[PDB]
Amino acid sequence: QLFRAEKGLRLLDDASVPVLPKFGDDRRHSPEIQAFIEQM
Amino acid sequence: SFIVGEEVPVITGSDNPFQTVDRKEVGIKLKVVPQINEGNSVQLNIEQEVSNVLGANGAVDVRFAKRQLNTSVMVQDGQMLVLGGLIDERALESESKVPLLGDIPLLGQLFRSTSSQVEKKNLMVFIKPTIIRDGVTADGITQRKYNYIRAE
Amino acid sequence: YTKLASALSSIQGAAVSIAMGDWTALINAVSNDSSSNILSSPSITVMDNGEASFIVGEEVPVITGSDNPFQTVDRKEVGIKLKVVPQINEGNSVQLNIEQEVSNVLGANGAVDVRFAKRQLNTSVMVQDGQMLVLGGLIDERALESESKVPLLGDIPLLGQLFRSTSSQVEKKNLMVFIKPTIIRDGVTADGITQRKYNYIRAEQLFRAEKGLRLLDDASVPVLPKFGDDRRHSPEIQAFIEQM
Amino acid sequence: NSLVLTAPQDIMNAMLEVIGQLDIRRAQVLIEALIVEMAEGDGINLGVQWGS
Amino acid sequence: NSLVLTAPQDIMNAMLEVIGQLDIRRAQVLIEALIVEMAEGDGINLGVQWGS
Amino acid sequence: GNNRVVYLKYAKAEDLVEVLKGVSEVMIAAHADT
Amino acid sequence: GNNRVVYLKYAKAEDLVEVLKGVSEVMIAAHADT
């Protein structure tokens, strides 16, 4: 999945590719939502 | 038992001389049996469902979109517990091109056809009990809901 | 134009005709590429020694003994399905009886009725309190080659491509299923898990409310209240009730 | 909604105690469910075709 | 949700001990499944035909 | 101690009732919820 | 030692119950899960 995310979507965002979290880490927000919640 | 929805006939053994039609329920449905301990905890047996009617695309009869949770849990007096949910992600890519002409650094777009798709879905269900033991608590809850509706 | 329309209906890629005097050369060439990536995560909360069922999907009628005087129709379930019975030992291990399924509807190509694409795992395992175990999976690889040529003319070092037809195909598939239990014994653990999931959903909703509706009010987006706060009126109704 | 009981004194007293213990008020529960659904989707198509 | 029990003292005490041992709280389990699917495909076709 | 209640870790009580009926012969009962 | 529990390596207990019923005649039971 990480290799597929390196060569992202042809005509879309490269961060929309589903990638599993690190082993035993659980889900995290996308960078845009993370920045939005950090600003708030 | 709680239902807000529709009653729909379906075929169970289908002009026609005898169709064997049965009427089913779709909508928002909640069946619950509570059991309060001697203190401040409630054990719940729950059947929860959200379902609607979709037209048949190649089936003999209409289809139902269905989301159902059947379980039994323990919750505190006025706290919330998560019953279940679903996280779905999907990415699709497709390309058709002329073998050698479609890789030219600039003029190759004239010999290509590309499609990309991304879909995300998030579903979650929560439940919350509240114990009413006296008339004042019930009066407070009823007054809250009544005043909300009346203010609208 | 009927025959020409039928001839060009199935063509994908380049099919180019060159006339050179009572002789036509048709060149066909195409390259295809496809990728797919799917992640799914169903979850359910149960009590010890209790059964739990989870379905997100569809209810489809099928023929079981098919105008028609009597069809003998039965309605079946397709979708993402999870049936689980847990058993906690006295400590920190859970024995699980699991039926897991992902299934959808495919149209019949030569069958009497519709078909179901189906992936199902039925088993029983032991997992630790908060660890992950692999239940099953599939690795599939496939390569296909095909060639048709004129016997001796198709082996000329350079001019032989004019007397050949070649097809090649490669397909790869990877499927995997994992499961993970978590024991809730007190109210604080359940509160933490519920708060995590609730705050995730609410953060997504608040972000969507920042970039409101394209041509409507930005406050009409549904946003969950704060954890343990219950419903409140919209600002217009709040101002109206404050004035009154 | 009445019970008619006939029995000697001791059985009568025991039965009355049992009835008094089982004839009590039950509490009530208000149960609220919350269903949240969110969906997002994005797609792009781009191509060039040549014909004669 | 009540039990009505009638018995002599010794059987009564034994039954009360058994009830007290069986009337306890059960823990809960949150169960999460994870389904991963990946597919890839590639093909090429090339040919020349002659006609008259 | 004429009566005991045993909490099982790995087995199922309904399974063990049939096995222990012969050995006991004495009453054996299973509570499935616990 | 009036009771024993024997863990089988290669055979199936349900199979051996029928065979040993005659030889024992005494109670023989099989636990399939273990």
Instruction: Please check whether residue A39 touches C, CB under 8 A.
Output: no
Picking from D36, D40, D50, D52 by the largest number of C CB atoms within 10 A of its own CB, the best residue to mutate is D36
Collect all residues of chain E within an 8 Å Cβ-Cβ radius of residue F31.
22
Cβ–Cβ contacts within 10 Å for residue B69, how many? 23
Collect all residues of chain C within an 8 Å Cβ-Cβ radius of residue A17.
37
Method used to solve the structure = cryo-EM
* Whether the Cβ atoms of residue A20 and residue A8 lie closer than 8 Å to each other: no
* Whether the Cβ atoms of residue B42 and residue D37 lie closer than 8 Å to each other: no
DSSP code at position D36: E
Q: Which residues lie across from B91 on neighbouring strands?
A: B118, C37
* Whether the Cβ atoms of residue E48 and residue C192 lie closer than 8 Å to each other: no
Three-class SS of residue C214? coil
Cβ–Cβ contacts within 10 Å for residue C28, how many? 16
Residues 74-133 in C contacting E (C-alpha not used; CB under 8 Å): 80, 82, 84, 86, 88, 94, 96, 100, 102, 132
Collect all residues of chain C within an 8 Å Cβ-Cβ radius of residue E34.
39-41, 132, 177-180
Instruction: Please check whether residue C14 touches B, CB under 8 A.
Output: yes
For residue C244, give both structure tokens: 């009154």
* Whether the Cβ atoms of residue B59 and residue C61 lie closer than 8 Å to each other: yes
Burial of B8 (C-beta count, 10 Å sphere; 0-12/13-18/19+): middle
Give the closest-approach CA distance of E29 to chain F in angstroms.
14
Q: Tell me the HSE value of C99 on the side-chain side, using a 13 A CA sphere.
A: 10
* Whether the Cβ atoms of residue C33 and residue F16 lie closer than 8 Å to each other: no
Cβ–Cβ contacts within 10 Å for residue B129, how many? 25
Sequence letter at residue B115: S
At least 3 CB pairs under 8 A between chains E and G: no
For residue F16, give both structure tokens: 């063990």
Resolution of the experimental structure, in angstroms:
2.4
Collect all residues of chain C within an 8 Å Cβ-Cβ radius of residue B11.
61, 71, 73
CA distance F28 to F5: 10
CA distance B49 to B30: 7
**Which residue from F14, B44, G34, E28 is spatially nearest to C94, judged by alpha carbons?**
E28
The pair phi, psi for residue A19, each rounded to 5°, is -130, 130
Q: How many residues does chain F have?
A: 34
> From edge to edge, which strands make up the β-sheet containing B2-11?
B2-11, B21-36, B41-54, B63-76, C52-63, C73-88, C93-106, C115-128
Among chain G residues, CA nearest to F16: G31
Give the closest-approach CA distance of A38 to chain B in angstroms.
22
**Which residue from B116, B91, B119 is spatially nearest to A5, judged by alpha carbons?**
B91
Q: Under an 8 A CB cutoff, do F34 and E26 touch?
A: yes
* Whether the Cβ atoms of residue C194 and residue C201 lie closer than 8 Å to each other: no
Collect all residues of chain F within an 8 Å Cβ-Cβ radius of residue E22.
5, 31, 34
Count of CB pairs separated by less than 8 Å, A with C: 23
Q: Under an 8 A CB cutoff, do B127 and D33 touch?
A: yes
Specify whether the backbone of C49 is left (phi greater than 0), alpha (psi in -120 to 50) or beta: left
Cβ–Cβ contacts within 10 Å for residue G13, how many? 16
- What long-range pairs does B31-36 form, CB within 8 A, spacing at least 24? B31/B1, B31/B2, B32/D31, B34/B129, B34/D29, B34/D31, B35/E1, B36/B131, B36/D27, B36/D29
Among chain B residues, CA nearest to C50: B72
CA distance C57 to B54: 12
CA distance B78 to B140: 15
The pair phi, psi for residue B140, each rounded to 5°, is -65, -45
* Whether the Cβ atoms of residue E46 and residue C162 lie closer than 8 Å to each other: no
Three-class SS of residue D6? coil
Give the closest-approach CA distance of F22 to chain E in angstroms.
23
Cα separation values, A26 from A16, A29, B44, D1, E5, Å: 18, 10, 28, 58, 51
Can you state the percent helix, strand and coil of chain C, rounding each to 5?
20, 50, 30
Cα separation values, B4 from B39, B54, B128, B129, C32, Å: 33, 17, 19, 20, 49
Instruction: Please check whether residue D24 touches E, CB under 8 A.
Output: no
Among chain D residues, CA nearest to E1: D22
Among B89, B91, B114, beta carbon nearest to A11: B114
Residues 21-50 in E contacting B (C-alpha not used; CB under 8 Å): 25-26, 28, 30, 44, 46
Picking from B41, B127, B144 by the largest number of D CB atoms within 10 A of its own CB, the best residue to mutate is B127
CA distance A25 to B108: 42
Chain F adjacent subunits, 3+ CB pairs under 8 A: C, E, G
Among C38, C163, C193, beta carbon nearest to E48: C163
For residue E7, give both structure tokens: 């018995």
CA distance G2 to G23: 17
DSSP labels, chain B: -EEEEEEEEEES----S---EEEEEEEEEEEEEEEE-SSSEEEEEEEEEEEEEE--SSSSS-EEEEEEEEEEEEEESS--EEEEEEEEEEEEEEEEE-TTGGGSTTGGGGGEEEEEEEEEEEEEEEEEEEEE-SHHHHHHHHHHHHHHHHH-
CA distance B127 to D36: 12
DSSP code at position D22: H
The pair phi, psi for residue C48, each rounded to 5°, is -60, 135
At least 3 CB pairs under 8 A between chains A and G: no
Burial of C143 (C-beta count, 10 Å sphere; 0-12/13-18/19+): exposed
CA-based R_g, chain B, Å: 26
CA distance F34 to F7: 8
DSSP labels, C178-208: EEEEEEE-SHHHHHHHHHHHHHHHHHHHHHH
* Whether the Cβ atoms of residue E40 and residue B93 lie closer than 8 Å to each other: no
Q: Under an 8 A CB cutoff, do A12 and D46 touch?
A: no
